[PDB]
Design a protein around this ligand. Structure first.
Ligand code: ADE
Ligand code: ADE
Ligand code: NA
Ligand code: NA
Lengths: 228, 230
């Protein structure tokens, strides 16, 4: 793993990464910018995808196919489900697409034919992240992260996702990014810090907490790069 | 490179079976957990695949066709639910696409809007005009209009009504807008063709089961007529 992608969805999710690097090259490609740097020995490729499943799919694919990365670390913010609250940070054990619905043909919610409802992340990277978290005296939650192309802000939708998928966080890119990595046989790590709890207060809470959460994730991802 | 390279993309095996049947002979390339079929046809190198259903798989497959296989243009062939005046058996090429299931309205954005992008993404005007000319030459009825995409198989009047009211879409499906957006981002001419298998209401599952292969065959036949006249 000499080339690693660091991916967020929004500019606020990668600004702290670039700030830490200080100097980097900028490559224009696929109607986006990709930032390249030699960071204490590994080549980092950094970008924000733009929001949602399609843009994050594109950007992850380009990082792997065009830039040739060996692994991909996703860093960003999410809504908390169940016991996940503002102040917490979670790495996915697996991802699901909560908005996939082909139940008309007798598939479960979340299931695309020829694929699976849950797609695992890298066990090896996840276990390293857990070791590092304990070293740093920080609590790293782990669990299923759910993804859809909606910003979720209702108890009704939250309860559906929890009941159907047993998810611990909700966001708009993790499952798409993780599935691209799965299909291309690239180790993935999906890290989210909690900005809101995906209920009726979520938009205001996001406005209050998203930058804090973005910085929390970016800080940990760079600690992981320092040791990976 | 001497030959244009064109991608022919469907979502399901049935959507590309008729394409492969017309080639008879092709190379099979395993990549990105899928199969890509490569053949020369009418002096053009065709790269043919089915993506698997939905926005993520179709985004991956289109990106791989462009980035890995180097295609110059992408023609999507498949089936869809008809909205408004569209009926089972009709064919429709998209003028533009929308993602009907995108919802960031919590922050004041319109339905379908991703920040930094646009609600409606155009397809290639040049390819669409060529298709309309060919349909006229062949005395075929080809509709055009906005096609809406989401990661749900739609089978309710309530959802149809929302999509029509919000987006003025004429068809609904699970890959067109994702494929078209990838093409837009990579500056690749796109053509999105759908034939109608159902009308996206409570009868849609049964109608799809009866008519999906018929519709797939119409779209594949027309896409190859288009390729014949490049
Ligand atoms: N409630 C929410 N829904 C979707 N994506 C999010 N990202 C942060 N909070 C979110
Ligand atoms: N009703 C429908 N919804 C989504 N995709 C389709 N493809 C064919 N019919 C469809
Ligand atoms: Na540095
Ligand atoms: Na907690």
């Amino acid at each position: 793993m000499k080339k690693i992608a660091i991916l967020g969805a929004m500019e606020i999710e990668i600004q702290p990464i670039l700030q830490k690097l200080e100097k980097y090259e900028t490559v224009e490609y696929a109607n986006n910018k990709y930032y390249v740097a030699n960071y204490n020995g590994i080549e980092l490729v950094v970008a924000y995808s733009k929001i949602g499943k399609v843009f994050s799919s594109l950007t992850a694919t380009i990082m792997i196919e065009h830039f040739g990365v060996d692994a991909l670390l996703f860093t960003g913010v999410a809504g908390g489900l169940q016991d996940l609250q503002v102040g917490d940070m979670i790495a996915a054990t697996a991802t699901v697409q909560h908005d996939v619905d082909i139940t008309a043909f007798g598939y479960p919610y979340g299931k695309i034919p020829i694929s699976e409802v849950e797609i695992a992340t890298s066990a090896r990277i996840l276990e390293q992240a857990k070791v590092i978290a304990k070293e740093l005296n920080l609590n790293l939650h782990t669990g299923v992260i759910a993804t859809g192309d909606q910003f979720v802000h209702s108890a009704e939708r939250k309860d559906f996702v929890v009941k159907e998928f047993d998810a611990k966080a909700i966001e708009m890119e993790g499952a798409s990014v993780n599935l691209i990595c799965n299909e291309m046989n690239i180790p993935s790590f999906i890290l989210r810090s909690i900005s809101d709890t995906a209920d009726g207060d979520a938009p205001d809470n996001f406005d209050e907490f998203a930058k804090m959460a973005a910085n929390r994730s970016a800080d940990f991802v760079m600690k992981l790069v320092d040791r990976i």
